[PDB]
């Protein structure tokens, strides 16, 4: 138990993030990228209409 | 069966060098945390005096 405490704290075993969990950092990155990409298309469409 | 003079019995140096690095990095990390406490103190004084 102390060995695994040193593993996690001193840094032996990586803390792997499960993609399925709601709060995974990769999930936040994917949501931000999806929003950002939809942003590029929204600007594209409205800029075409403006032109 | 050659297990104790120049083949199989140098595990002592394994764990002792591991522990010696453990102590070198404990001293290094303790000095680093002294520096971190100094930085925390500087930020604390700055932010509290700002408040």
């Amino acid at each position: 138990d102390i060995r695994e405490e040193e593993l996690l704290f001193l840094g032996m075993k990586k803390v792997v993030e499960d993609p399925t969990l709601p709060e995974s950092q990769y999930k936040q990155a994917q949501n931000k990228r999806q929003k950002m990409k939809y942003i590029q298309e929204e600007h594209e469409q409205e800029f075409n209409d403006e032109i | 069966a050659r297990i104790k003079d120049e083949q199989k019995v140098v595990t002592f140096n394994k764990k002792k060098l591991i522990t010696y690095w453990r102590k070198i990095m404990r001293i290094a990390k303790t000095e680093q945390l002294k520096n971190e406490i100094d930085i925390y103190s500087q930020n604390n004084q700055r932010e509290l005096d700002s408040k």
Binding site: - | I3, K4, D5, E6, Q7, K8, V9, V10
Partner: protein, 52 residues
């Protein structure tokens, strides 16, 4: 269908005439002492490098 493996003649290996055929017992105990701890110098280098 099963292609039954051929009953090839077993090894009965002819022992290679390498350096392992040099000296008698007492110097074998000395050579023993000469490869008995350290190779785990190397295995422990592996272990410590894996820990790092």
């Amino acid at each position: 269908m099963p292609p039954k493996k051929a009953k090839g003649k077993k090894k009965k290996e002819e022992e290679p005439d390498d350096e392992y055929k040099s000296m008698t017992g007492a110097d074998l105990t000395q050579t023993l002492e000469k490869l008995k701890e350290r190779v785990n110098e190397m295995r422990t280098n592996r272990n410590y490098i894996q820990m790092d």
